[PDB]
Design a protein around this ligand. Structure first.
Ligand SMILES: *[C@@H]1O[C@H](CO)[C@@H](O[C@@H]2O[C@H](CO)[C@@H](O[C@@H]3O[C@H](CO[C@H]4O[C@H](CO)[C@@H](O)[C@H](O)[C@@H]4O)[C@@H](O)[C@H](O[C@H]4O[C@H](CO)[C@@H](O)[C@H](O)[C@@H]4O)[C@@H]3O)[C@H](O)[C@H]2NC(C)=O)[C@H](O)[C@H]1NC(C)=O
Ligand SMILES: *[C@@H]1O[C@H](CO)[C@@H](O[C@@H]2O[C@H](CO)[C@@H](O[C@@H]3O[C@H](CO)[C@@H](O)[C@H](O[C@H]4O[C@H](CO)[C@@H](O)[C@H](O)[C@@H]4O)[C@@H]3O)[C@H](O)[C@H]2NC(C)=O)[C@H](O)[C@H]1NC(C)=O
Ligand SMILES: *[C@@H]1O[C@H](CO)[C@@H](O[C@@H]2O[C@H](CO)[C@@H](O[C@@H]3O[C@H](CO)[C@@H](O)[C@H](O)[C@@H]3O)[C@H](O)[C@H]2NC(C)=O)[C@H](O)[C@H]1NC(C)=O
Ligand SMILES: *[C@@H]1O[C@H](CO)[C@@H](O[C@@H]2O[C@H](CO)[C@@H](O)[C@H](O)[C@H]2NC(C)=O)[C@H](O)[C@H]1NC(C)=O
Ligand SMILES: *[C@@H]1O[C@H](CO)[C@@H](O)[C@H](O)[C@H]1NC(C)=O
Ligand SMILES: *[C@@H]1O[C@H](CO)[C@@H](O)[C@H](O)[C@H]1NC(C)=O
Ligand SMILES: *[C@@H]1O[C@H](CO)[C@@H](O)[C@H](O)[C@H]1NC(C)=O
Ligand SMILES: *[C@@H]1O[C@H](CO)[C@@H](O)[C@H](O)[C@H]1NC(C)=O
Ligand SMILES: *[C@@H]1O[C@H](CO)[C@@H](O)[C@H](O)[C@H]1NC(C)=O
Ligand SMILES: *[C@@H]1O[C@H](CO)[C@@H](O)[C@H](O)[C@H]1NC(C)=O
Ligand SMILES: *[C@@H]1O[C@H](CO)[C@@H](O)[C@H](O)[C@H]1NC(C)=O
Ligand SMILES: *[C@@H]1O[C@H](CO)[C@@H](O)[C@H](O)[C@H]1NC(C)=O
Lengths: 242, 298, 248, 49
């Protein structure tokens, strides 16, 4: 990221590293471009020539995928301190060997309970397009010419309407699987287990749980202007909203 | 300079193809990279009389692939198609069209995959070693060693047959398993049309690129398909309206190729999700679903 | 009793719950607290939903910028073509603008259709996970969390759903010497719902997913014949619980 | 055709019908297609020894 540093490595895809100053015409290029072909810190990957990254014989997880097993990362502790872009071959994982024997077995003596999180999209944003206003934009002769082009606008609106119905069908299929709205008893004791962080909280105006509030705060969902936007758009403000 | 008037078509085509290219590596990571640790097989290969020598990795080969994996790689006649080198050879003295250098000269490149075939083979080796030496226990957490005969007793108890059937018939079951592996070898060494599903994946991606290359000879109603001839033979009043047809036709052909690649990417992603499900439920465990993994009781 | 049923679903006896209920409750509460800490500290984990926002904001903005294109016309402003050119030349110049804007809008509709198909596939997967793991207990491996599945809890999210999968993971292993069968009095004995294990000298029978040694009797073993056929069979004594009743 | 056994479903393995592998539920009147056979009891000759 440019928030971190401005140091850059360059990949020439497929090119031999000796043919790099021939592939780009670096004599005609500026001297700032000439330092990325000079031959100083140059490696040849299977995808081509990588200039500006220091090859390390260690293996780490893939940070920035270059290709053909080669990844790169901005490492802080390179050399004496001197943060720089390093390149390596990515590591598959820890090496292990099961002690197989024909009369030996391994049986656990204890357990653990793991609660994990899985996130799945369900529906997306329902949009609508005014084709006459988009194409012409307050021009009567344009609309008179556009009437000759047929029924493109009708089938475009039909497709967008089908998508907009399908999103509501997706949400109804995922969430409305139960016919009755069950509610918990007022005594929140279930065998010593604690469900206070997933049961609804009546303190909030919208009866969501704590974790649901965290999930709604984490995703920066745009308001998208489906709640009465045009009164704001009439007023002249210095920050034109998108 | 004429193309700059169009604008953001090329950027969104590049973004679509970049999304497809990232999605292929995501699919390959989803299917194969499911095991945390790279297990290896013990040096003694007596797994209850079962013979696993034809699927375990072969150290004699330079790339540590098995015998059956070598047959599977040999039956698919994958071309060069990039993935290594393919520049400098085009500058070299081949003096032929080669069907790949023309795409490289026309702005159509092929990126190599992130995971090489040695690394995919190491993933399959780890999955095979974990399945042989630990059963389903390595899919639920740490691997627990167990003899292969008692693992087969577990597999028989899963399908409703008591384990005394196995211990009275263990040698016969081992002989039947070895005979079936030999029949797989006899099936793969003669019929090259068994791997047609992957050959279609190669052939469609070659054929779409060949069509996209061959579409540049079209005129699209202009006087010539050569770009410089319209500039040389006409002044700027009508050369722009003659080359606008060429730009519109080539941009529409590029949009058609990107749309077909998006639909094919969705189909390939669905198949990769199915393959990840079959790896999770049938390799890492035992499946009770009917006809999900082979005909008969899995 | 429900969690005892969920333990009998995964092949662990129910008393393992009832002798370790407080520890399991403490582990569940600690895991819920770790989920809260992970969600309050890291925001990138919701990125699967965030792209669902971004693809519906990056496209429309792109659809604005295509109005700046000329598509070979003399001007992207539509009224200048009318006010500066005669009618035949104006129609010639505006045909290109209409065709280009129509093509851009059709491209947007096609991309929205493909993205809607992908979102529908994800929603069908989410409905399947709601049906099988929330409304029941799944026996499918790695469908709902790593380990043996016990429960799942649904939570809403902006443009999506979040499942909290509660699963069982075996923790502390131990080596044992094992045998497939025990041939006592010339009869081969096979375990019913366990495995034969040993600690040096004594042979016991356990459940497979938890170490609970028991005395090998005739109740938890069955006989299938002579020991000659079995390979790896050993010799031990199988206790008869009815034997002290024969003395009286 | 001569004697009655109980087997497992997926493999033929006849066993003597005893009380250890069968369970009792009600009388003989309601079930359609019931047959007559002697169910062996292992504990009865052992207690009489
Ligand atoms: C199966 O696995 C479970 C968990 O995986 C085990 O349950 C835990 O067992 C350990 C050890 O038996 C327990 O740990 C003990 O906890 C006591 C209380 O801890 C609280 O208070 C301290 C401050 O006093 C906090 O730091 C801590 O976070 C808790 O809030 C401690 O007082 C004990 O310390 C004593 O022993 C340690 C060595 O273990 C010494 O160093 C100390 O000086 C002191 O003498 C000890 O740490 C733990 O409470 C159990 N429960 C949980 C939920 O973790 C099962 O024991 C295991 N079963 C088998 C058969 O192995
Ligand atoms: C199930 O879990 C819930 C949640 O952990 C638990 O309920 C209680 O929740 C509250 C917050 O929802 C926890 O926080 C405390 O609430 C008490 C209320 O009297 C406050 O007094 C506490 O304030 C102290 O700590 C602050 C920390 O900043 C200080 O600023 C302040 O000066 C006080 O020192 C604090 O906010 C509370 O800890 C839990 N209760 C317990 C016992 O953990 C519920 O009890 C759990 N149920 C079961 C059966 O386990
Ligand atoms: C159950 O028994 C098996 C086999 O007896 C044990 O596996 C073996 O454990 C030893 C001790 O940890 C391992 O030795 C160490 O290996 C590492 C890695 O190679 C090496 O760096 C050390 O210097 C040391 O030699 C050994 O490799 C391992 N495997 C085999 C095949 O012998 C296992 O630990 C036992 N488990 C329990 C819970 O008792
Ligand atoms: C497992 O099968 C392989 C073949 O699939 C066996 O290897 C063969 O061994 C015979 C020994 O007479 C040789 O003649 C063959 O040339 C071998 N074939 C190959 C491909 O190597 C192997 O012996 C079998 N292992 C066991 C334990 O039966
Ligand atoms: C170019 O790179 C390839 C490896 O990709 C290598 O085999 C070849 O020798 C290189 N050519 C030169 C001239 O260095
Ligand atoms: C990596 O190892 C090779 C061969 O051992 C050596 O030539 C090279 O200098 C090493 N590079 C680093 C950065 O250690
Ligand atoms: C079991 O493994 C040991 C160790 O290699 C070996 O000596 C023994 O012969 C094996 N048992 C059988 C039946 O092959
Ligand atoms: C169950 O018993 C606990 C104490 O063991 C008590 O606090 C609770 O009110 C009782 N009832 C319910 C519905 O949990
Ligand atoms: C629209 O009118 C209602 C009626 O009072 C008002 O509550 C709401 O704020 C108005 N919306 C805007 C955008 O002004
Ligand atoms: C094996 O475990 C049993 C169960 O407690 C014990 O009685 C016996 O002494 C143990 N044997 C050895 C050799 O430790
Ligand atoms: C078990 O006992 C039988 C009969 O005395 C004997 O033949 C055999 O060698 C013993 N040991 C085994 C099966 O390891
Ligand atoms: C079984 O025995 C009872 C009583 O002797 C008799 O009524 C019945 O008909 C018999 N059924 C058959 C099928 O023999």
């Amino acid at each position: 990221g440019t928030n971190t540093s401005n140091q850059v490595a360059v990949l020439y895809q497929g090119v031999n590293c000796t043919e790099v100053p021939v592939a780009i015409h670096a004599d005609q290029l500026t001297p700032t471009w000439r330092v990325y072909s000079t031959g100083s810190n140059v490696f040849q990957t299977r995808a081509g020539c990588l200039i500006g990254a220091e090859y390390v014989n260690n293996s780490y997880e893939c940070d920035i995928p270059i290709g053909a097993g080669i990844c790169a990362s901005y490492q802080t502790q390179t050399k004496s301190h001197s943060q720089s872009i390093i390149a390596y071959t990515m590591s598959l994982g820890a090496e292990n060997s099961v002690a197989y024997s024909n009369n030996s077995i391994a049986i656990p003596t204890n357990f653990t309970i793991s609660v994990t999180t899985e996130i799945l999209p369900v529906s997306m944003t329902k949009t609508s397009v005014d084709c006459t206003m988009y194409i012409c934009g307050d021009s009567t002769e344009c609309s008179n010419l556009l009437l000759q082009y047929g029924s493109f606008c009708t089938q475009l609106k039909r497709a967008l309407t089908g998508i907009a119905v399908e999103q509501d069908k997706n949400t109804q299929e995922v969430f409305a699987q139960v016919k009755q709205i069950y509610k918990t008893p007022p005594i929140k004791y279930f065998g010593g287990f604690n469900f206070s962080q997933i049961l609804p909280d009546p303190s909030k105006p919208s009866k969501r749980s704590f974790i649901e509030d965290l999930l709604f705060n984490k995703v920066t969902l745009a308001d998208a202007g489906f709640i009465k936007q045009y009164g704001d758009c009439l007023g002249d403000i210095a920050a034109r909203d998108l | 300079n004429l193309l700059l008037q169009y604008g953001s078509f090329c950027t969104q085509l590049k973004r679509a193809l970049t999304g497809i290219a990232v999605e292929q590596d995501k699919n390959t990571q989803e299917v194969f990279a499911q095991v945390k640790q790279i297990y290896k097989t013990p040096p003694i290969k007596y797994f209850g009389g079962f013979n696993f020598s034809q699927i375990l990795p072969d150290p004699s080969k330079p790339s540590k692939r098995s015998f059956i994996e070598d047959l599977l790689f040999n039956k698919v006649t994958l071309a060069d198609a990039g993935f290594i080198k393919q520049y400098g050879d085009c500058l070299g003295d081949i003096a032929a069209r080669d069907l790949i250098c023309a795409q490289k000269f026309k702005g159509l490149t092929v990126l190599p995959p992130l995971l090489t075939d040695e690394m995919i083979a190491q993933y399959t080796s780890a999955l095979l070693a974990g399945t042989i030496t630990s059963g389903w226990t390595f899919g639920a957490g740490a691997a627990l060693q167990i003899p292969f005969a008692m693992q087969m007793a577990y597999r028989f108890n899963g399908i409703g047959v008591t384990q005394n059937v196995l211990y009275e018939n263990q040698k016969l079951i081992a002989n039947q398993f070895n005979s079936a592996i030999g029949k797989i070898q006899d099936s793969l060494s003669s019929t090259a049309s068994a791997l047609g599903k992957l050959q279609d994946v190669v052939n469609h991606n070659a054929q779409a690129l060949n069509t996209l290359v061959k579409q540049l000879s079209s005129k699209f109603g202009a006087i010539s398909s050569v770009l410089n001839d319209i500039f040389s033979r006409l002044d700027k009043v009508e050369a722009e309206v003659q080359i606008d047809r060429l730009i519109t036709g080539r941009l529409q052909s590029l949009q058609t190729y990107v749309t077909q690649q998006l639909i094919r990417a969705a189909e390939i992603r669905a198949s990769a999700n199915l393959a990840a499900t079959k790896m999770s439920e049938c390799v890492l465990g035992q499946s009770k679903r009917v006809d999900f993994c082979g005909k008969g009781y899995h | 009793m429900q969690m005892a049923y969920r333990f009998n679903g995964i092949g662990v006896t129910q008393n393992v719950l009832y002798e370790n209920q407080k520890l399991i409750a403490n582990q569940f509460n600690s895991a819920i607290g770790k989920i809260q800490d992970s969600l309050s500290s890291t925001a990138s984990a919701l990125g699967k939903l965030q792209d669902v926002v971004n693809h519906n904001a990056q496209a429309l903005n792109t659809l604005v910028k295509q109005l700046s294109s000329k598509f070979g016309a003399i001007s992207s402003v539509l009224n200048d073509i009318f006010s500066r050119l005669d009618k035949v030349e104006a129609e010639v110049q505006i045909d290109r603008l209409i065709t280009g804007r129509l093509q851009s809008l059709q491209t947007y509709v096609t991309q929205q259709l493909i993205r809607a198909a992908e979102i529908r596939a994800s929603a069908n997967l989410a409905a399947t996970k709601m049906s099988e793991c929330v409304l029941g207990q799944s026996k499918r491996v790695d469908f709902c969390g790593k380990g043996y599945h016990l429960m799942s809890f649904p939570q809403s999210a902006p443009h999506g759903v979040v499942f909290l999968h509660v699963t069982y993971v075996p923790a502390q292993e131990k080596n044992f010497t094992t045998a497939p069968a025990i041939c006592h009095d010339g009869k081969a004995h096979f375990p019913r719902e366990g495995v034969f294990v040993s600690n040096g000298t004594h042979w016991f029978v356990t459940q497979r997913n938890f170490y609970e040694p028991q005395i090998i009797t005739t109740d938890n073993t069955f006989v299938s014949g002579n020991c000659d056929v079995v390979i790896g069979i050993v010799n031990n004594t199988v206790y008869d619980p009815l034997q002290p009743e024969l003395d009286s």
